[PDB]
Amino acid sequence: IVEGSDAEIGMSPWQVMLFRKSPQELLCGASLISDRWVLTAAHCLLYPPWDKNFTENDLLVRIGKHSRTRYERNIEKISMLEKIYIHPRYNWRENLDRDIALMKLKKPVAFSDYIHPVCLPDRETAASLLQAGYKGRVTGWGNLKETWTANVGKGQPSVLQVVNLPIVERPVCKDSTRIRITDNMFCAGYKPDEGKRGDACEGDSGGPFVMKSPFNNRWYQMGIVSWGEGCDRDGKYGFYTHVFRLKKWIQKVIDQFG
Amino acid sequence: ADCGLRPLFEKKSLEDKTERELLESYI
Numbered sequence: 285i286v287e288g289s290d291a292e293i294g295m296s297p298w299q300v301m302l303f304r305k306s307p308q309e310l311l312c313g314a315s316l317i318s319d320r321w322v323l324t325a326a327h328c329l330l331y332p333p334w335d336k337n338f339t340e341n342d343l344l345v346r347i348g349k350h351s352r353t354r355y356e357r358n359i360e361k362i363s364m365l366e367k368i369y370i371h372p373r374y375n376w377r378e379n380l381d382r383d384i385a386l387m388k389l390k391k392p393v394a395f396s397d398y399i400h401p402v403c404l405p406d407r408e409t410a411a412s413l414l415q416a417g418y419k420g421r422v423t424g425w426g427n428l429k430e431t432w433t434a435n436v437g438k439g440q441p442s443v444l445q446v447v448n449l450p451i452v453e454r455p456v457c458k459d460s461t462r463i464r465i466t467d468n469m470f471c472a473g474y475k476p477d478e479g480k481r482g483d484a485c486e487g488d489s490g491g492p493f494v495m496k497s498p499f500n501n502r503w504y505q506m507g508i509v510s511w512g513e514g515c516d517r518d519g520k521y522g523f524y525t526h527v528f529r530l531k532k533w534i535q536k537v538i539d540q541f542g
Numbered sequence: 543a544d545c546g547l548r549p550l551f552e553k554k555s556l557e558d559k560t561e562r563e564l565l566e567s568y569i
């Protein structure tokens with residue numbers, strides 16, 4: 285997370301950490317939407333251009349973490365995966381169109397002060413809130429900077445990072461990149477003449493883009509961190525998977541079996 | 543069905559240090 289700030293304890297109870305069995309590594313963020321279902325980005329699990337192909341087997345899942353590095357004894361829960369469901373039409377070949385996957389845990393989890401699911405938006409809620417200039421929030425344990433080049437400062441946070449970013453007018457989004465954009469996407473962050481900065485980065489995918497309802501003082505997952513070009517660059521914006529456009533498949537996989 | 547309400551915050555009728563910002567952008 286670029287230019288964010290240390291998250292408060294229990295501030296983002298659905299935050300999930302995708303973790304590699306060996307080598308032990310943080311792969312992505314993810315979120316809790318039930319005590320059995322987890323939502324992330326598909327490129328987190330499968331990205332052939334880079335030799336990426338993780339099976340249920342290769343990973344762990346950590347719910348309740350704050351510290352990135354340290355094992356929080358009676359707070360965190362390490363779960364194993366039963367299944368992985370990737371959108372049949374996720375386009376890894378070109379623009380990462382439909383960058384979504386679902387993970388159902390081996391056994392349910394029990395909610396606590398640090399473990400609590402987030403809502404998925406309804407028709408009403410999507411529409412009411414997915415307005416340009418409306419601010420959402422991002423959380424992660426990803427890169428504090430563009431790490432593939434020589435830089436000063438630490439490259440990764442010790443604790444959960446949080447950033448609050450405005451939604452941008454598609455046209456702005458559209459014109460900001462040579463990458464083919466789609467209805468399943470939305471770009472967010474500040475404009476070079478706003479004076480505020482911030483963005484998500486490498487290691488942030490799968491993390492939620494959440495919004496609070498003025499209507500029911502409830503948090504909803506509107507986006508999934510997806511892709512971007514560098515991090516916190518002027519005249520560029522981060523791209524997030526459009527959760528509302530994807531609910532249909534979402535619900536379909538979630539309710540299949542009883 | 544209990545989703546999006548935080549124990550240490552909404553469960554507590556408490557607020558996070560920067561959620562107003564968000565509430566303030568929603569026209």
Ligand SMILES: *C[C@@](*)(O)[C@H](CCCNC(N)=[NH2+])NC(=O)[C@@H]1CCCN1C(=O)[C@H](N)Cc1ccccc1
Pocket residue numbers: 312325327328331378379380463483484485486487488489490509510511512513514515516521522523
């Ligand atoms: C998965 C990730 O953690 C990461 C998130 C990047 C978000 N960036 C910003 N600034 N908010 N995603 C990626 O790194 C993805 C996966 C593969 C390439 N990629 C990119 O973001 C590239 N930088 C650009 C790109 C290449 C191909 C298709 C889509 C985007």
